[PDB]
Amino acid sequence: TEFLKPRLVDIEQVSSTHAKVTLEPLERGFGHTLGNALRRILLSSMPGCAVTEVEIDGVLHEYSTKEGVQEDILEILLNLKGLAVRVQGKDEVILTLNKSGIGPVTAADITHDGDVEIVKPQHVICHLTDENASISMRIKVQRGRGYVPASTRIHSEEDERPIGRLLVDACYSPVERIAYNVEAARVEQRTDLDKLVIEMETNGTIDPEEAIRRAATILAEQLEAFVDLR
Amino acid sequence: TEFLKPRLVDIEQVSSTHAKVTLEPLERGFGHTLGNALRRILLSSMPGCAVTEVEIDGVLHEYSTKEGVQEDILEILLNLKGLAVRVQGKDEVILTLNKSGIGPVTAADITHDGDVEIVKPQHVICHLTDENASISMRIKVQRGRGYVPASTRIHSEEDERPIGRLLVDACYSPVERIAYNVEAARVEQRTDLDKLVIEMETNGTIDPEEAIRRAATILAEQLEAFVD
Amino acid sequence: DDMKQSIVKWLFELNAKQREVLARRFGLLGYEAATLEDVGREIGLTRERVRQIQVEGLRRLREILQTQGLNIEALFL
Amino acid sequence: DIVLNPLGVPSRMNIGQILETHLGMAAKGIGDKINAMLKQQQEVAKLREF
Amino acid sequence: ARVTVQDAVEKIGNRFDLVLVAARRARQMQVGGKDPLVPEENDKTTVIALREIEEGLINNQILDVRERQEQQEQEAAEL
Amino acid sequence: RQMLRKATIVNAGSSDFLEGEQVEYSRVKIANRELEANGKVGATYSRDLLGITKASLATESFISAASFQETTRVLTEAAVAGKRDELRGLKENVIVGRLIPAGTGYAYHQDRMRRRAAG
Amino acid sequence: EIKELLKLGDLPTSGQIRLYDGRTGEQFERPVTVGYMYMLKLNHLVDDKMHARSTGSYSLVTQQPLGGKAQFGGQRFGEMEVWALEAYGAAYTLQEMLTVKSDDVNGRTKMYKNIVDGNHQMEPGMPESFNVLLKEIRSLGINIELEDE
Amino acid sequence: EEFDAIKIALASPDMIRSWSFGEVKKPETINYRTFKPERDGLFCARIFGPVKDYECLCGKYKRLKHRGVICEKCGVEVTQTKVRRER
Amino acid sequence: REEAVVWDILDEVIREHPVLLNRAPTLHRLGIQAFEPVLIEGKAIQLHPLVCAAYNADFDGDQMAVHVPLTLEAQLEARALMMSTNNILSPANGEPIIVPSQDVVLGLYYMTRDCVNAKGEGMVLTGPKEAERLYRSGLASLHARVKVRITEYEKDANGELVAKTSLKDTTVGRAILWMIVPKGLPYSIVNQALGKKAISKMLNTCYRILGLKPTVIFADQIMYTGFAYAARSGASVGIDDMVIPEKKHEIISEAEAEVAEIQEQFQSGLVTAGERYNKVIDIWAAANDRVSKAMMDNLQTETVINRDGQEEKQVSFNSIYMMADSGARGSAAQIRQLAGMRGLMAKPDGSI
Amino acid sequence: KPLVGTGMERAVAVDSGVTAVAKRGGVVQYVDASRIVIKVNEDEMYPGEAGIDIYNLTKYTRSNQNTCINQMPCVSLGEPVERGDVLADGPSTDLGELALGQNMRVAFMPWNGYNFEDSILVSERVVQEDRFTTIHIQELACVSRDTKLGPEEITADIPNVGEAALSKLDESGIVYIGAEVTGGDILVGKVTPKGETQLTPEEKLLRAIFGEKASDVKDSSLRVPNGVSGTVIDVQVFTRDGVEKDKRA
Amino acid sequence: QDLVVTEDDCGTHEGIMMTPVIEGGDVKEPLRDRVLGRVTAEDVLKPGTADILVPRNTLLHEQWCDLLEENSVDAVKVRSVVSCDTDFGVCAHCYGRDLARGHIINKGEAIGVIAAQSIGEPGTQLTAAAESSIQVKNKGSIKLSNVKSVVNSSGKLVITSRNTELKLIDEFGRTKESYKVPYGAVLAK
Ligand SMILES: Nc1nc2c(ncn2[C@@H]2O[C@H](COP(=O)(O)OP(=O)(O)OP(=O)(O)O)[C@@H](O)[C@H]2O)c(=O)[nH]1
Ligand SMILES: [Mg+2]
Ligand SMILES: [Zn+2]
Ligand SMILES: [Zn+2]
């Protein structure tokens, strides 16, 4: 046993979305070992917040068109799937959006809750063309993980069945893209050591450092079964 | 987070060398995630002891043939690569082997050191045919990990390499073979879950179960960098 | 088949004088499907006592279908 | 996005799909380069040149 | 037996007769509730019949023997 | 072999074959076994080759013949001959929805054949 | 022209790239052709293609199950399909598909009851289509009668 | 139900009359209003049997209570409707 | 209502119950085969690759029919007579119909086939397990020439197997495939670079020595390892893989002057139209052979850039060629219209 | 749009007529999902009329193959437009070019036999992005006929129906607009007059026990085909002249 | 249709004597492959007639077929379906091995259907003639049969017979290669 632990060295946040994380020193071959095993967890298991439910007044179904609005209701739903939201305290929040006049409705027009951060305020939701047109809607954001479509959700719950509530495919998973590059790290004696450079691209919020901590946690939690129980 | 942990289900020890281990349930994709990351540690990183250096008297190179011996020197070296040895105290030991007469030379003919255990005493090393034939050699056993060939050692270490010192590919890693198969596991609701079947083949001293425990340990030891 | 056989099982689980007028009326065991007034030709020879005994057989059998697990379960079909 | 079997090409003799794939990649390469220059916001002059 | 039927076929010989013999035995366990010789190990009557034939416990002639044995003892009881 | 099923008898036997009748070679050889034992007038014959289509129509079974082809003609020929098919072939049994006289069915079908032989 | 366009993309002349197995993280032994193919989802869906039936409606004269998934149809086991069972020697499977599965009206109900009672006993009879054939032949003015045993 | 062999021969006029359970003398199928078979028509229930199980046409005899009964009124035997494919 | 408990019951019933799969058209008895069903969420039937041969089933939108053997007799008919494991050999010729195709052959070809030195030429390995360990560890290619020591099991005069340990010169790849090989078969069968033609003989040999059970498991193993290594190989279809003859334009201009000579001999009224037709067709038929031969020598043995000593020749590792040579896919006439010349096409008449 | 095209894509899309094209060049006065108003330029604009073209766009309608035909507006409010330009895209067209499917990142290589004979291995990412997801508009009809026994009713009042089922039906017996439905849910309630049927002696006995006499009104209700599931986007009612109209109609 | 295995052994001595197909230079169908799993008739031994080699009623196993090649058997009487004496079917012996099973056919199996399917399927599924000159490849003595040639002005053996065959006789005296020499062909020797 020549046990040797890595330490988190550099967190280069080129952007809130894109971040590089260098990691050293890693013993020879552990670069790819951890690199890949982490990449798999990072793409799937990572939890986040996403739009589950939408309710626009004067809208019975997603296939209709609202007058004074360029986008069809489905187009608007697609935009909300891609809305970046961070919820600090609660797991479920309902944000309200009332906007009027000749304006491209952005994410900033939503009444922000005390503990609710809209990460991309300029994010487009809807285009109001007629000045007399006013749009009013209630966007329900829940916290979860992976991809939970509206087809899996219309075949389980359904105790309350309100006509005029639009269910939306939840894209909870924050990790958009991840790649890990393994370069050689040089110690005075050990030149076979390696550094692991993990390039992450996530939607809004989920912090690069925080995500890595959670990903390593889930791996160690699974390893409990192979350590503790034999 | 609804953290879903697997639980160790079946340990089928078909043999002390060969063992199958089924594992369920694993959340979707974690079968290959754990499967491979473990396989890598189990093969290249598991530590043990192996023959690094050989010196037979009257042998200048590995390609020659010694009279009164069925096996070519290469054949003998191949047999030493597969020699199971446990060293308790020291990291480097030189064992001496002097044997004569009409005998299949086994591992037991080696003069065992106080803290040196030959795990497979019946292990074949050489076949002496002529009764007048006597073989005398010094087998250097070092402790290491993974697979270190002599081709990757000559290019790196260019210090002392005098003639007659027979270099042999070092197999410190005790894991002889490992494969992990991922099949789907069924829950009443979750059919996307998977089971991980890890077939291990290990040599002497190191037990299949023991090795797996140590493998997960080495991974968790490097998982302290990011706190949790 | 299952429906017709089911009743028979619970038809012999009632009283001896409750399944000797209820079946001899519907024509289940008997030869001819009689009416309330026609059951008098056998041995009953009554009009009100036949109607009380018919429905008494039916009421004890309704509770035999409620306990085995039918009643409202077998109502839809 | 997709993994197709190459064993369904030499027998089929439909090499159009391969050329489409190479050119499609080249088209997407230019797209990724314009995408990179728009993310940086270099300027009208430089985008025009490329 | 379950995957490969070859050893079971080599006991009786005629594939067609193997099917008839294992079907008649499986009908016994299916309807009579006749007790299995081999541990079922949670297998269907069909599989049990074929295992029994592979090991050489069931046979057209042996079935016919136990048929007359039990039928004749019942005739003895009647008279 | 199926093409060489039939044979034309040139010269009378001890049965009612006589010149020019075309019968299955199986049946005339079985007749020749009984002639060998009894002597009597032996039957001289010649084997004939038949094309697949005509060979299928030459089978004694009119159910088989009609099911194949030419159905209007087959049934007029059978109806006028007053032909009776005792059902031996697979086709015929499949049509009435019965057990095949082959494979699994050979066991049961021979058990029937002995029930038929003994009454 | 395409290779020149690839070079403006800083992509390789081969259009083959180094790819990594998502599972293992190790590279594939050699370059793989990677790029963008314009693809189509055809009208043929699995929701419109998958069909299953145990028991359902039966045809008017022939009494065999109907055709087509929209009418809840049985798959046709055709002459060619029959011959395959004949080759195999599987006599009961064949008779089954001729009788209890198809026309035999007594057989199918009796068989159903046997299946729910666990006992997979075969209780076959005569296909209703054959009865019809005979009646159709007699309507043609040809006497076709059954000589009993 | 189980027979040994099958014979085909010429249909005698007299043989054809053996199978027949009545002479059809009208082109009439059913009545336009009561979709019920017309007298001595191609669908005559008086000849080929009852439309409904154990039911005469005019409905005088119903259920197994009247088994082999021939309704004097409509002239229909009370039996299984199965016979309409047989007779 | 599809209640939770109903799925567990369904699971109970289908176990040990064979089901018939059928594909149109049913040309021979193997067009229908029985399998043990495995319940899957998702609406498509999953078919075993090795029996795709019997069905002629390619998944370009093919559909199949499912039939339930109901009676105990029908179930036993399915399990004994119609089970896929029981019906391997064609009834037409005494040949196994269940034979790897496509990816499977390509993978095994890739493993067995040798390269010059590469990673770890002339190493010495204790068992095929050390070989597997070396390959996946990344200190040996599958094509590395190596003096390994494998112990083959040869059958004696009786039913007893005589084992024999020896050092042969095979690749790492061949050692690893030996692990799939049952005990009883010789090592020399796998020691060659394996193609579809050799793998069928492998299955035949296995059937005649070992019997049914071993062949069935062996066939499955071969399928798994075949796909597995096919995917590892990262083999693909480039535009550089289609090599054409450096001497095409010469052969064509020559053949074109030749055809012009016979056209001129026609214009002189000596050679008939029919004779010229035949001689023009003969000139082009020979031109086609020569160009194809040129492509195939240029492609087959194009790897004339080796090492160790000096310049050495070996079989080309062109993906397209490998595919044709293994018999995985493509042929010598398929490569003609992929790099050489298309050739002469014959009309709907039949005439060229 | 297809990255690797030929050029015919534009001509096919425009010439097919499924795309709304501009009759006359000018500036867009009013964009909407439902319609497009363009104000014509003075040079093309006739001296008679106001000179403002209004194109009403055809929205989510059924195709003959039960696919979805929708016209999306592809102009911005107040944009200068040339005559014969694409104002709105048809179902399979992108900015006037033909878009029949979707280009994506493909690699040619064997993969564990999941691409065996042309079999295709696709990333979950494509499913998630819902890009290959498709719309099918299906049309279910409920016919109230006049029979020998009497007229059929379209009431919500049906023998043996749970309040769960009748929740989605209005007073008339027709499902509400926007309501999500799955196999077996009733879309339109319909009940049919039952004449005489000889009740088996066991049913005579059984109905004597329970007492619930077989209601004369039977059940012919149009329900969701087994295994299809979707959202009601529209309802149409055809009545003859003089039958009492449903509350829903 | 009707043809089924009815009997085990018809007890017939009948069969058809088969030979090796040597069409061209590569042996298209060997005798071993053409008589594999076919009930041999009478007693077929080795060339030198002085000792028996194979039994009368014996299935042709790969073993006995290998021995046939070492003994160089020219031609062998094999039991055939056509020569079967079984009435209303054929015996397992006259047929031989069920090719699909790899052993002797089971009585009761419906052979005819299998035969017709086997012949028909390939046709149904399947739905450079510059032969200027024959080159002989191994050394041998030229052996013509069914040939009537005449010498010409040039000095060349021109053939004036339609079905002329050309054999290639080895050292001991057996047929290795075989060709079709057509009418009006010019022979070298
Ligand atoms: N019965 C029937 N089968 C068809 C028809 N059209 C195509 N097929 C089948 O679908 C398949 C299409 O050709 P392929 O199967 O690709 O040909 P292949 O045998 O794979 O040969 P290669 O293309 O050289 O690999 C064939 O096997 C045909 O049998 C048809 O009209 N009728
Ligand atoms: Mg296909
Ligand atoms: Zn009446
Ligand atoms: Zn015979």
Check which CATH number belongs to the domain holding K173 and give it: 2.40.50.100
Number of helices and strands in chain J (H, E)? 4, 17
Inter-chain touch A147–J128, beta carbons under 8 Å: yes
Q: Which residues contact B60 (CB under 8 A, 6 or more apart)?
A: B163, B164
Alpha helices (H) in I15-102, listed in sequence order = 52-55, 72-76
Q: For residue C72, give the nearest of C57, C60, C62, C59 by alpha carbon.
A: C62
Report how far residue A117's alpha carbon sits from residue I134's, in angstroms, rounded to the nearest whole number: 53
| CB count in 10 Å sphere of residue K176 | 15
Looking at chain I, which residue has its C-alpha nearest residue D17? I237
3-state secondary structure H2-46: CEEEEEEEECCHHHHHHHCCCCCCCCCCECCCCCCECCCCCCCHH
Cα D15 from chain centroid (whole Å):
17
Tell me phi and psi for residue K76, to 5 degrees.
-140, 135
For residue I286, give the 3-state DSSP assignment.
helix
- From edge to edge, which strands make up the β-sheet containing J52-56? J52-56, J35-40, J26-31, J80-81
**Chain A residues within an 8 Å CB radius of G25:** 32, 35-37, 39
Looking at chain F, which residue has its C-alpha nearest residue H10? F79
The residue written with tokens 């160089």 in the block is K72
CATH architecture label of I239-352: Orthogonal Bundle (1.10)
Tell me phi and psi for residue I69, to 5 degrees.
-70, 120
**Nearest CA to CA, how far is I134 from chain B (Å)?**
8
Q: For residue I65, give the nearest of J21, G74, K38 by alpha carbon.
A: G74
Structural contact between residues H3 and G149, judged by C-beta atoms closer than 8 angstroms: yes
CATH 1.10.150.390 fits domain F52-118: yes
**Equal CATH topology for J18-92 and J133-243:** yes
The residue written with tokens 């971040």 in the block is A19
**Nearest CA to CA, how far is H40 from chain J (Å)?**
24
Report how far residue F97's alpha carbon sits from residue H7's, in angstroms, rounded to the nearest whole number: 18
| DSSP category for residue C68 | H
Structural contact between residues F35 and F14, judged by C-beta atoms closer than 8 angstroms: yes
Partner chains of E (3+ C-beta pairs under 8 Å): F, G, I, K
Residue type, E46: T
Residue D12 CA: which ligand 1 atom is closest? 23
Pairing of strands K103-104, K97-98: antiparallel
**Chain K residues within an 8 Å CB radius of I29:** 100, 114, 117
3-state secondary structure F69-102: CCHHHHHHHHHHHCCEECCCCHHHHHHHCCCCCC
- Retrieve residue F66's tokens: 């009609």
Resolution, Å (one decimal): 4.4
- From edge to edge, which strands make up the β-sheet containing J72-73? J20-21, J86-89, J72-73
Q: What DSSP string runs through C14-45?
A: S-TTTSSSSHHHHTSSSSS---TTGGGGTT--
Structural contact between residues I286 and I294, judged by C-beta atoms closer than 8 angstroms: no
Q: Is D11 in the pocket of ligand 1 (CB under 6 A)?
A: yes
Report how far residue B78's alpha carbon sits from residue I125's, in angstroms, rounded to the nearest whole number: 7
Residue type, J134: T
**Chain G residues within an 8 Å CB radius of I233:** 28-30
Structural contact between residues G56 and G72, judged by C-beta atoms closer than 8 angstroms: yes
Q: What DSSP string runs through chain A?
A: ------EEEEEE-SSSSEEEEEEE-B-TTHHHHHHHHHHHHHHHT-EEEEEEEEEETT-SSTTS--TTBSS-HHHHHHHHHT--EEESS-SEEEEEEEEESS-EEEGGGS---TTEEES-TT-EEEEB-STT-EEEEEEEEEEEESEE-STTTTTT--SS--TT-EE--EE---EEEEEEEEEE---SS--S-EEEEEEEEESSS--HHHHHHHHHHHHHHHHHHHHT--
Q: Which residues contact F115 (CB under 8 A, 6 or more apart)?
A: none
Q: Is D40 in the pocket of ligand 1 (CB under 6 A)?
A: no
Tell me phi and psi for residue B139, to 5 degrees.
-100, 115
Q: Report the alpha-carbon angle B72-B74-B78, nearest 5.
A: 120
What is the Rg, in whole angstroms, of the alpha carbon atoms belonging to chain C? Answer: 13
| DSSP category for residue I331 | -
- Retrieve residue C1's tokens: 């088949």
Q: Which residues contact J145 (CB under 8 A, 6 or more apart)?
A: J151, J152
Partner chains of K (3+ C-beta pairs under 8 Å): E, F, G, I
Cβ within 8 Å of I, D 8-37:
8-11, 13, 15, 18-19, 22
Give the dihedral sign, CA I104/I109/I112/I116.
negative
Q: Is J4 on the interface with G (CB under 8 A)?
A: yes
Report how far residue B106's alpha carbon sits from residue B92's, in angstroms, rounded to the nearest whole number: 22
Cα–Cα separations (whole angstroms), residue G17 to E10, G1, G28, G88, I173: 56, 19, 10, 51, 25
| CB count in 10 Å sphere of residue J64 | 6
Size of interface G-K (CB pairs under 8 A): 12
For residue G16, give the 3-state DSSP assignment.
strand
Q: In CATH, which superfamily holds the domain spanning A1-47+173-230?
A: RNA polymerase, RBP11-like subunit (3.30.1360.10)
- Retrieve residue C47's tokens: 């009009």
| DSSP category for residue I348 | T
Domains (ranges, CATH) in chain E? 1-79 (3.90.940.10)
Instruction: Please provide the CATH number assigned to the domain covering J133-243.
Output: 2.40.50.150
**Nearest CA to CA, how far is C56 from chain J (Å)?**
9
Identify how the structure was determined: X-ray
Structural contact between residues G125 and H1, judged by C-beta atoms closer than 8 angstroms: yes
Report how far residue I166's alpha carbon sits from residue I153's, in angstroms, rounded to the nearest whole number: 11
Give the up-direction half-sphere exposure of residue J243: CA atoms within 13 A in the CB hemisphere.
15
Report how far residue I52's alpha carbon sits from residue I23's, in angstroms, rounded to the nearest whole number: 10
Cα–Cα separations (whole angstroms), residue G63 to G68, G114, G130, I199: 16, 21, 11, 50
Inter-chain touch H55–J148, beta carbons under 8 Å: no
Q: What DSSP string runs through chain K?
A: ----EEES-------EEE--B--BSS-SB-HHHHSTT--B-S----SSSSS--S-SS----HHHHHHHHHHT---EEE--STT---TTSEEHHHH-EETTTTEEPPTT--HHHHHHHHHHHHHHHH-----------S--EEEEES--EEE-SSS-EEE--SSEEEEEE-SSS-EEEEEEE-TTPEE--
- Residue whose Cα lies nearest atom 13 of ligand 1: it is I58
Helix axes J201-210, C48-68, angle to 10 degrees: 80
Report how far residue F79's alpha carbon sits from residue H10's, in angstroms, rounded to the nearest whole number: 6
I101 alpha carbon, closest ligand: 1
Instruction: Please provide the CATH number assigned to the domain covering A48-172.
Output: 2.170.120.12
Structural contact between residues A71 and A226, judged by C-beta atoms closer than 8 angstroms: no
| CATH label, B1-47+173-228, candidates 3.20.20.100, 3.30.910.10, 3.40.50.300, 3.30.1360.10 | 3.30.1360.10
**Chain H residues within an 8 Å CB radius of J203:** none
| CB count in 10 Å sphere of residue K102 | 19
